[PDB]
Copies of this chain bind each other. A is one copy, B any other.
Amino acid sequence: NSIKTLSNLANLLAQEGKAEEAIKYMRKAVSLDPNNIKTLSNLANLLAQEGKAEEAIKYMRKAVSLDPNNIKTLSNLAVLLAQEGKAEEAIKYMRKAVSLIDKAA
């Protein structure tokens, strides 16, 4: 609803290279529903796109905690951790994703 609208505006501003405003609207969107995985991941990726990897990782951990079996979230978190030089933890989450993929098949 309003979350989707805020998300659209945010992503438009970001795709136009105006990331700070995008982050403002995104934080609003997350505030409206703090348990939405999609919006949390969106916020995270916007923060990471700005070089702020730590806060991004925070929100990604939140999203993972919301659903530990989603391989997209696990993979994304793993990527963020790897970019920050946390090899062991990244490899851990990636391998968890591998296990889930192999299990579902």
A90 beta carbon closer than 8 Å to chain B: yes
Q: Which residues of B contact A87 (CB under 8 A)?
A: 101-102, 104-105
A82 beta carbon closer than 8 Å to chain B: yes
Give the shortest distance, in Å, between A19 (CB) and chain B (any CB). 13
Interface residues on A, range: 20 to 34
Q: Which residues of B contact A101 (CB under 8 A)?
A: 82, 87, 90-91, 94
Q: Which residues of B contact A8 (CB under 8 A)?
A: 12, 15-16
Pick from B75, B91, B95: contact of A78, CB below 8 A.
B75
* 8 A-B pairs (CB sep. < 8 Å): A12-B12, A82-B101, A87-B102, A88-B105, A91-B98, A91-B101, A94-B98, A94-B101
